[PDB]
Amino acid sequence: SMSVKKPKRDDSKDLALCSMILTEMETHEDAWPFLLPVNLKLVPGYKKVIKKPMDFSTIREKLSSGQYPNLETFALDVRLVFDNCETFNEDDSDIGRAGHNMRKYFEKKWTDTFK
Template sequence: MPRGKWYCSNCHSKQPKKRNSSRRSHTKGGGTVKDSESSDHPPASPTPSTASNTNVEDAKEEAPTSAASSPRKETGNNRHLTKKQQRELAPCKILLEQLEQQDEAWPFLLPVNTKQFPTYKKIIKTPMDLSTIKKKLQDSNYKSRDEFCADVRQMFTNCEVFNEDDSPVGKAGHGMRTFFESRWMEITGTPPPAPVASSQTHS
């Protein structure tokens, strides 16, 4: 007779079956985990914080690649000018900065306040000031020195038309014009373009 317990086929069918208890299987780390078949609940999915952190890390890794691969946009206000025009207008930027630094520049730094001087618009048809000239220079609106020089002279002409020669503003205008004409010659090595006759007159 073979060793161990044994039953006949009829007795074995009557033997009570063991409950399918949760079986455990060993993992490589030495711990144990329940078999998914014996658990009433499916394995828990990664927590939202873990998933979000993973997405953040992936985004961080991809960001440098996308930034490096994207073409660099053209910047600067000189994109509308040729290199020859940029060289030609370079002295204009220098001279404009020097005009702004003069002690007599105070009447010309900003546009004339037409609320304070309501008749100004009736007399002066082409207002001009250093801030407007600077903005046009930065926006590459000037294509030549002549255009820049014409606006500077227009500013001084407006001053002469609207103000008396012996007034503080009138004196400042004459001093600034003299500085501009002489400094232009020193910086560019050529005399400034001939001034264009103005149609503005005293009212």
């Protein structure tokens, strides 16, 4: 509360470390469905159904331009990528499986780096 603060968690490396995690997600073999924004002209249904599209390129631009106020807003956008994927894709599709694998991969790196 006013003039009563929990001890300062060192956040000075967060930007670098989110960038490293994002690099690892970008270079994963199963990243291909997520590297670029879904083409809203060419994919029926996507625009109407997926209220907040997100992809790794868009996260990378946001990261590089100070559009994440903290590491939780970065994790929200990453998870949004996988949540959108599950919304639109059957679990038993290549893309559906890719998204489960990537979410697992991300969540481990997240835990190991920050928790």
